[PDB]
Structures are given as C-alpha cells and as structure tokens.
C-alpha cells in the first residue's frame, strides 16, 4: 500500500510532471540538429552522445507515470459520468427495459455488457437502482427475467467482464490515446532518432495560449477540405483543353535535341500543372512554351489570364475567410461570455438595471442572492445531511432533487422584485 501511497504522489504531481516532459524534448531535438553512416560530433563537453543515451531512456519513463496519474485522475472521473449516465438512463427510460439501443449508438451498446455486472455501480453510490427499477419497471415484467438481466486468489476474484467493459470506455478518450500515442512515439523514436522529434508536436496541447490559434481553424476545417476538393478538379478541367489544344506548348525540354518531353501521355500533364502551376504563383504564363506568333496564342493569351484569376480569386478566397472570417467569430465568442456575465444574472437572469437600481447591488446580488458556487457548497451539504434530520426545506428540495425536477430555482423571478 506504500506503492499505492506512492501512487497518490504522482496523482499529486501530474502537471508539473507533464510540463517537464517537453523540457526534455527541446534539448532532445535541439541536439538532433547536431548530427552530421550517420555521424554526430561534439563541440564543448566531454560525453554528449553518451548523454543522449541517457535522455531518450529518461524521456520515455517520464512518458510513463504521467499517464498513470492520469489513469488515476481523469479515468475515475470520466468513468463516473458514463456510470452516472446509465444509472440515470435506465431509471429514466429503461432502454434495456424498453428501447434496447439501435444499430447505431455504440456507447450504450458497449454498455449492453456492463448491465449484468454484479459489482456494477462502482463509483456512483446508488446501488439500489439495480433493484429499484426491478421494483419500478420489473414490476411490469417477471422478476427473474430482470434478475437474470441484472442480478493468489486475486487471480479469480474480480468483476471480470467489467474491467473488460471498462477498457472500451477508456480508449474512447482521445487524450488518453493521445498520451498513449505519445508513449508509442516515445518508444520507437528512442529506438531510432530520425523519428524522435515529433514529441515536439505536443506543443499543440502545450501552451493553452496557442490552442486559441488551432481552434480558430480546427473548428472550421469541415468547410476547408471542400475548397481544395474544388481546387483539384477545376485544374483537372483546366488541364484537358491544353491537353487537347495546346499540348505542343508543353516542353520540359532543353532545346529539343535533348530527349524533349511533352505532356500528352497517360496522366502527368495534369500532375505537372498542380505541381508547378499551383506552386508557381506567378501565373501559368511563366512556364509555357512562350509564344510570339501563333493564332492559337490568342487562345493561349486568354488561357493564362482566366487561369490567373483562378489562381488569384480561388486560393485567396479559400484562405482569407479561413484566416479572417474564421477569426472574428472567436473574437465574438470571447466577447460573447461578457454579456450575461455583466448584464443579467446567471440564475435569475434578469438584468443589471434592477440589481443596480440599488447602488453597488448587482455585484453583491450576484454574490449574495445568486453567488452560483454557493449552490455547489449547498448540494454537498445536504448530501452529507441526514434525511431524517432534514428541515422542511432540506426535505423539500431533496425530493425535488430526487426526481431531477428543478422547479425550485428562482428562474426569472428573483426576491426583491416582489417586495417593498
């Protein structure tokens, strides 16, 4: 249990242990540019690449215990809500009573196997709903059709399929898998350090300040791929006309005495275009067989020009709203908290007029009359309060809570409004 006592110590120390993990990876991938059969040299110290053989090991074990604290930090929390869900669910609808979830919705379908675990509601402290619904709904049915539905030597004495159920929940966290990815990224790049740099990806979840930037486009990216999905095909349109009518203007050739190259084969003329003409930028009238005297030149004259805008007006109108119209929403959304936080209440949601009709009141009205986290403190307290020694109120809203009803809340109808 000293180990378990020590396990709490890394539960204590995660985020500092998280933060130093990158501080390995800089000097890791700082000296990975210090390479040159692949040679590495020394410049100042005595034993440098020996200390490389230290650090890659050293990073990897750092990449271990951070997830284990996380395995005891977030995993019991996120297992709880899913556990909180189904206990709230099966009382409220009884889908395994009635609905038996459909061909989609794998989540409860994964939990189609947890419902007959005998040590089921581990972290949700209301074990009786395993039998209360057998009294509530299983009244309407046979008890046994619900009781078979519901209910050293350590090698044989666990809720065996429950942990087996539990893993298919824990892999449905990205961040765990992202850390598990980071651990798999820890192994093989340590095994070969031409591939141990992409631990520097972890700046993405690194400075939270940065995540504003990627969210300013990762919210948008569903629309993004359509644009380039348009882009490749219009040049695929645009290639075939010259492939029909200008293919003689297509030399990668050095003066023809070379093995002079055209673009009228299977499929490369187009692949030429998107490789060159998109990476060109300066139009397509920079790489064609440059004309002086054709009459097809007239049709070539127009050809670059409408292509030029369809360089210009396409790619810009791709990226600009992607770089700007994406942005101002996040400028808006960070504004958007600052209205109800200022104007109205959260709880009674009324306005700043009424509670600063009284001088200085609305702050205090939000700090006495509504003071939201008081309710949190409150709901802890009644939970730890005896039911028998409830007050009238402590009985009352308990019963309100027990049916998940919430009509006690001072909705838009606060105190002093009806007074004088």
């Amino acid at each position: 249990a000293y180990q378990q006592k020590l396990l709490n110590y890394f539960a204590r120390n995660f985020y500092n242990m998280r933060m130093l993990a990158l501080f390995v990876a800089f000097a890791i991938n700082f000296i990975l540019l210090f390479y040159k059969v692949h040679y590495v040299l020394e410049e100042s110290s005595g034993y440098m690449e020996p200390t490389l053989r230290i650090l890659a090991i050293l990073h990897t074990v750092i990449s271990f215990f951070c997830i284990i604290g996380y395995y005891c930090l977030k995993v019991p929390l996120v297992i709880f809500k899913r556990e909180k869900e189904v206990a709230r669910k099966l009382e409220f609808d009884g889908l395994y009573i009635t609905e038996q979830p459909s061909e989609d919705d794998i989540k409860g379908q994964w939990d189609r196997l947890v419902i007959n675990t005998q040590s089921f509601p581990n972290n949700y402290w209301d074990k009786f709903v395993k039998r209360k619904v057998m009294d509530k709904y299983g009244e309407f049915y046979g008890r046994d059709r619900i009781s078979e539905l519901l209910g050293s030597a350590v090698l044989n004495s666990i809720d065996v399929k429950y942990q087996m159920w539990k893993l298919g929940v824990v892999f449905t966290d990205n961040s765990f898998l992202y850390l598990a990815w980071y651990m798999t990224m820890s192994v093989l790049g340590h095994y070969n350090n031409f591939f141990f740099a992409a631990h520097l990806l972890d700046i993405a979840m690194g400075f939270k300040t940065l995540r504003t930037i990627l969210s300013s486009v990762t919210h948008n990216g569903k629309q993004l791929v359509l644009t380039v999905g348009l882009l490749a095909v219009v040049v695929y349109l645009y290639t075939v006309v010259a492939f029909n009518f200008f293919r003689k203007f297509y030399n990668k050739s050095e003066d023809g005495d070379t093995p002079d190259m055209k673009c009228d084969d299977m499929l490369t003329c187009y692949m030429f275009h998107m490789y060159v003409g998109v990476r060109a930028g300066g139009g397509i009238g920079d790489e064609i067989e440059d004309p002086a005297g054709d009459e097809y030149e007239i049709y070539r004259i127009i050809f670059d020009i409408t292509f030029f805008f369809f360089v210009i007006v396409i790619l810009l109108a791709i990226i600009q709203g992607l770089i700007i119209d994406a942005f101002g929403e996040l400028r808006d959304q960070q504004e958007q908290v600052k209205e109800d936080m200022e104007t109205k209440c959260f709880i009674c949601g009324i306005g700043n007029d009424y509670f600063d009709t009284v001088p200085h009141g609305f702050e205090t009205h939000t700090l006495q009359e509504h003071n939201l986290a008081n309710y949190l403190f409150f709901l802890m307290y009644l939970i730890n309060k005896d039911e028998t020694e409830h007050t009238g109120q402590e009985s009352y809203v308990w019963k309100m809570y027990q049916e998940r009803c919430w009509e006690f809340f001072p909705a838009g109808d606060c105190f002093r409004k009806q007074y004088e």
Binding site: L73, K84, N123, Q336, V337, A373, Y375, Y381, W406, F409
Partner: protein, 58 residues
C-alpha cells in the same frame, strides 16, 4: 441559509476546476436548451462535487 464547511472551500479554490467552470460557462452561454440548462448545470454540480471528493483524498 445553511452551513458551508471549510474543507470543501479548500477543494473548491483550484484554478484547475475553476477553469473547468469557466469553459463550462463559455460552453453554456453557447448551445444548450434552457429548460435543461439548469439540468446540465446540475449534472456539472454533481461531477464537480465528486471531483472534490477525489481531490479530498490527496
């Protein structure tokens, strides 16, 4: 009125969980049914309290 114990305030004050409240806030000024806004808020209360139970044994 009622009592507020002190130890729960000590579990309350962490900017970790204060920030979870903050992103929760920014989430719920955005999307969510109002008649269930306080519902999901309640569930948020439940899990955050349970979290402070976790933070207790540390």
């Amino acid at each position: 009125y009622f009592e507020i114990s002190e130890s729960s305030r000590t579990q309350w004050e962490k900017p970790q969980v204060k920030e979870s409240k903050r992103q929760f806030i920014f989430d719920v000024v955005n999307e969510g049914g109002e008649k269930e806004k306080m519902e999901l808020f309640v569930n948020f209360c439940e899990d955050t309290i349970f979290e402070m139970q976790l933070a207790a044994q540390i």
